[PDB]
Ligand binder design. Sequence first.
Ligand code: HEM
Length: 154
Amino acid sequence: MVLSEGEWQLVLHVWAKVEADVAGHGQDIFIRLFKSHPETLEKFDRFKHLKTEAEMKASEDLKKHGVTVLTALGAILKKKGHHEAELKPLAQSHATKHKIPIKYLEFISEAIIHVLHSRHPGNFGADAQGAMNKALELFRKDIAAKYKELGYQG
Ligand code: HEM
């Protein structure tokens, strides 16, 4: 898929708001993911023991991880589709070390969209959400293609 420049400049406009508080947004997103899809928590040896949202909010380790995640994704979005180099190491670790099925990337996409909708209604009307959806779809289709080349595709 190709995004128009107008779609990228809906994506980067709302992303600029997220970047005012990267840790806060990272926490919201992971809690939403772990609540909506508990099976995903199982993939983190580091966080599997968290039982409640309170404990998730209280974890400084999860907060740090959310920051790493969003920083990496933000580096990707800012490339506007020219993200082949950034994707290679992420695909390799998620395919071979962590073993993350595409389906779970669909789940965190949903979590991201849910949090941007909740926190930034004014900058995330229908057109901006459609743009963000296309950007994340692009990300998932490119990572899926790398998964396949790497021998994981799943
Ligand atoms: C927006 C999509 C995501 C991005 C950009 C992302 C990014 C990252 C980055 C940069 C790291 C650290 C370096 C590395 O190991 O590659 C990481 C680690 C990790 N990721 Fe993701 N990730 C994503 C989605 C997921 C999902 C959906 C899952 C599981 C449901 C997952 C599971 C993990 C695990 C288990 C680790 C290692 C954490 C630890 O023990 O330190 N990731 N990810």
